[PDB]
Design a protein around this ligand. Sequence first.
Ligand SMILES: O=C(O)c1ccnc(C(=O)O)c1
Ligand SMILES: [Zn+2]
Length: 441
Amino acid sequence: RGSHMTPKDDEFYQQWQLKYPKLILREASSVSEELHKEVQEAFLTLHKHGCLFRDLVRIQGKDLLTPVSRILIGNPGCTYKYLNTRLFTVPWPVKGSNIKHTEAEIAAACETFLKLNDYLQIETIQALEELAAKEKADEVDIKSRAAYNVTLLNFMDPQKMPYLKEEPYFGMGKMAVSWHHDENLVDRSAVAVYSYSCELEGRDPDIWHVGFKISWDIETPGLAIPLHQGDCYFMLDDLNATHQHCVLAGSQPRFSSTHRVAECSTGTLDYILQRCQLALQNVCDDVDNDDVSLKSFEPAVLKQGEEIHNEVEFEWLRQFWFQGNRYRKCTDWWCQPMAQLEALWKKMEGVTNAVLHEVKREGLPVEQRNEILTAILASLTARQNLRREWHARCQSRIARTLPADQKPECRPYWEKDDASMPLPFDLTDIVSELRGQLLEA
Ligand SMILES: O=C(O)c1ccnc(C(=O)O)c1
Ligand SMILES: [Zn+2]
């Protein structure tokens, strides 16, 4: 049978030392009391303002509201995509920055989680240095695998959330968060967790734990680590890759701050603006109007264009507004940036329209035409499929169930009669005709 260990078992510590040596635990005692005060107050203040939300996530074709509710705080302009959902940071006061976008208390709370972020980073570097020293018995690889750019805050009150699946392999009881890896992190990057609980026969049901197992493996007993108020733990190096973890609910409300190094090479505002500019290079930009005319109709430039159009629409606008407008509750940092990405995308609807006009044109040899179609067709079919997916996802029986405060908005969205927009929202007819054309004979 499947079993787990806790500090109650003699094997616990040796199983820890032998098969989870990259799991580190620093009890509340190792953390200054003033930091405990500022951090716990910050949690409570964010909860009081209604800043944490359950996400209407997606999993294997199903829309599911997270039991846990969350907020993501970190570097400005930075995102973190988990479960096909792109969380946008409410910014913290990282250097050379200013946020008139957040509220006094909320801004102070992000300040605090910045302080906590710095603290944990220092501990993580210390621990990775110790780890390397044991082994063999770069400095910059360590620096970068501890360089937390975000933190995902969690809240769950099990008493007002009586809907928890049981741990299915080791009898660890009730799961606030089931077995998973933390995804979309920088390779071998550490993860640090601050745990704030509002304080026989296996683990204690009343007390929050984090569960650990080896991937693919349910014969090796799992480890259930008890978490008391202010305990921190670190997942080092490849632990998050080779092991899975879950969060086992106790009986009392609990917050957590999960600091991570998000892989954001295609996940920052700067990055997505730069891609937009790149696409608009193919556009004569003397003036902003509806007479969009393109500098080139070379396949490669058109393919790239339609790809960037898809990127900004679906990984950026539809993601942001699917949660909308709940960010506005904590900050307005993303208000202008999202307006601007919407205007760039509008232009791109324009570009696509120039391309269609060009393919449906008199003096154009069918060879060049077919070149263009093969270059853009994949992108338009993906655009249609992803629009159906987002519209439907915006209308799930469960989507239309949570507060208007966070009802998904399907945006951008326009009716067939919408004269401001050059192309229909529904691309079915267009894609049909293009396919037909490429098959003539
Ligand atoms: O609540 C936690 O301690 C925790 C730990 C690790 N991961 C998550 C998560 O939500 O991914 C939450
Ligand atoms: Zn996790």
